Amino acid sequence: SHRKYEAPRHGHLGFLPRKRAASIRARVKAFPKDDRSKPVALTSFLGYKAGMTTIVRDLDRPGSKFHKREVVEAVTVVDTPPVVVVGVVGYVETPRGLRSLTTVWAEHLSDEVKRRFYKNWYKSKKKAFTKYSAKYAQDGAGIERELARIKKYASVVRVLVHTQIRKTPLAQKKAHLAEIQLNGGSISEKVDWAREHFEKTVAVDSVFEQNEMIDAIAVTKGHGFEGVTHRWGTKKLPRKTHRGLRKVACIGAWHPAHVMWSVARAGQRGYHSRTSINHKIYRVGKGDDEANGATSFDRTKKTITPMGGFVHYGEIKNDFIMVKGCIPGNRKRIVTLRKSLYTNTSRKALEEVSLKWIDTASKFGKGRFQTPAEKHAFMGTLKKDL
């Protein structure tokens, strides 16, 4: 008979199965639709999540109760040194779907990206792409033929890039390699662009800019095996119920004589792939800017890195992206930043961000000081300093 009181089900059936993601780098499942008359452009970028901090924004939002008023907001900092273009892949349309027809690599690759092709790098003879690089000799036949094949048959063109992980504070030396779709001119112009950009760097400010909505694709933080109460958000059973209260009391009271797929069960929590959308870029910071932590209202010459560095990350010494709010993944995880799949019609996508202040107090405690000069000036002369 019918359930007496209505309640919505616990959890979302479209995020199934709640299994560990197959890779630590979450896949981009859809790129923006290509417009051929537009100039050539990358559709995505790769970065590393460094941490969070706090800002003060001078908000312009007509019709809002906080119009012409200051708001304090959380932001996420992503460390984004330039990526290095190393290859190009062509894709053809078939009745079974998109098929990669051919791949062309650049003549010279760094050991940073060569490490991605090894499980035991220190023992290997490092022979990867050595015979391939010999195909660039004597007027480059083979290379030219495969570029001609891409031009003649490809309906989609993607470019193989990799991170420069040696510019981050990470202990990992092996770089991250990814395909990034080229949306822009014709197929021929896409291929010419890729061939021209082989072994060259693309910086994040030649892909994004401030006041733009982007999407964050990443694997969430893992939490191991989890019970139903916290994995699914179900209600705890009364105190000292026999055989536990972090359970669902009845997993089936009705006919099918099985456990339904729609019933909450204990299992893996976290380390899933997620694509969150519409995060506004608050700042595109440059790595050689001495005051990239400073605003027009705060005249302190300071960088973005908080005192003592980001906890478990280190210091920001490269270009960075500051997006408001939070993104999937924990600090130092590789994240993919994607351009919007559609033209956002909300006015927040039109707002221009004007930051009044960026928090650089220490995250390793209840940080009270923004700079070491400020801490020293407030405290005064110490016993060791005399």
């Binding site: 019709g63 209202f297 705060d298 005249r299 006015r347 700079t371 400020e374």
Partner: protein, 94 residues
């Protein structure tokens, strides 16, 4: 409201509150006032004749620098002797 209706309408038009400022120079209207400088609020230092007050403070500083406000041996002991005593005391404590 006519300006608003021709620009964006209600809830889309963003009015500039600085346009009615009565300042000495009209180019100063769209100027950002700084608020923080190295842990200090600019507003509670902002004052007319702060330049004269700073000058008086500097005269005080010069008077101290002339007076000598900013500027190993004992009776019965030389420098090597006090060093020897210090080393022996450190040895004893250790």
């Amino acid at each position: 409201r006519d300006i608003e209706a021709e620009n964006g309408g209600a809830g889309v038009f963003n009015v500039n509150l600085k346009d009615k400022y009565l300042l000495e120079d009209d180019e100063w209207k769209n100027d950002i006032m700084p608020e923080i400088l190295d842990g200090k609020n600019v507003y509670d230092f902002l004052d007319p004749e702060i330049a004269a007050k700073l000058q008086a403070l500097e005269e005080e500083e010069e008077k101290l620098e002339n007076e000598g406000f900013y500027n190993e041996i004992y009776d019965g002991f030389e420098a090597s002797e006090v060093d020897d005593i210090k080393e022996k005391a450190a040895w004893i404590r250790n």
